[PDB]
Amino acid sequence: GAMGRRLGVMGGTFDPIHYGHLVAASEVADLFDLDEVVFVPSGQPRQVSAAEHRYLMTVIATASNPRFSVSRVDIDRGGPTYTKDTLADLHALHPDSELYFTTGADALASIMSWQGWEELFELARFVGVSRPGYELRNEHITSLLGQLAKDALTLVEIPALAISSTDCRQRAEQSRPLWYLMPDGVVQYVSKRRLYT
């Protein structure tokens, strides 16, 4: 892009993926002049749907966008997902790109608290996304994340993240419509495979 080779890495369980995630990816790509956003469904952790389901929904959701792709690195590694391993794996595939690891602000707080912050900032820049008013509801998480990272971490508020996977699962459970919360292909996957019933 305008600032050199840059790759977004959208880490999440994606159970299910929804337009909130897709809007967040689009926003972060625009904000940081990213060339591509790679969606990386996380390993098995509630019990999340089987990995292949979450992979396929993400493939279906992102297929039409030339600037989105999906990586199996976390689901195929085996065992729990450590963001250091995700980033190590993607650096090896894209050694000439700066990595921008993107996930929910709550998850970013967990990653940074025990994963090994200093080694993480060697591998990537970090982007935490949330619904608006995150800083107001989480004063101290926000300021602590800011102190640790400085220029390497950025928090971004996305109105469309009012759409949550938790709400989508409940809608599916209750047979309420998922139309226009996610692509029809994902609505149908959820329906066809009976995911949250």
Added chain:
Amino acid sequence: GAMGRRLGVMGGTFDPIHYGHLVAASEVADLFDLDEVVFVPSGQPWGRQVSAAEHRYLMTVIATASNPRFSVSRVDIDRGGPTYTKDTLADLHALHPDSELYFTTGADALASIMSWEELFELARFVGVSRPGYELRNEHITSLLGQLAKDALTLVEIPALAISSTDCRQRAEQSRPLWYLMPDGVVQYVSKRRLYT
């Protein structure tokens, strides 16, 4: 439908239409077992600046085309003059004489319309709101009064966090509209340079 012959009427300016509106229509259709939802772009408002009616019509046609349960009506944009919901309802009642009409719009707008006794004989009213929406006091008391009497329904729609105002701002700021609305609407806004 299961609760009777029922038609949703989604009233709004739709400048632009976005997934929040489509989600809201889908939700209200489910809650009330509506057979179909008719989107009715409003007439030009009577210093508020709103895209030409044909643009708002075409965007709403593009956005709803693929859904068999959605359609778009020109009654308000073709009537001439300012839009009075009583006229919208008279026109639609004439076109769909056996349907009970469920007029659905933003909670703010539903409160504005109620400055109503004869309107409530013509349709059932549904206000849709985004989480955390802050109403002016005059609208709060209006809505409280009718809720107190079970005379209308309010429904929270998380996807209404997506707003037409924020869409126009994104377009003005050259920020992406992808996944906030269908691609055909993103492209319409772009091709016609709507919010420059």
